[PDB]
Subunit: 37 residues, 2 copies
């Protein structure tokens, strides 16, 4: 039960997931785009 | 060391992953749409 290198690792994980999230939204926006042009 | 801010962080992580999951299915559905049939 020390301190937490674990929290630090989870924070990186959650930041990396938010980065994949903005990219996925970018893919989605680009798709709902070329469903026109 | 007895409680868990860790659990809380993991719960936000897992929720964020389920959000990317629905968007990824929305991408795939949109793709299998603008396809052959």
């Amino acid at each position: 039960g020390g301190r937490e290198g674990v929290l630090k690792k989870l924070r990186a994980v959650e930041n990396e997931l938010h980065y994949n999230k903005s990219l996925l939204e970018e893919v989605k926006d680009e798709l709902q785009k070329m469903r026109q042009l």
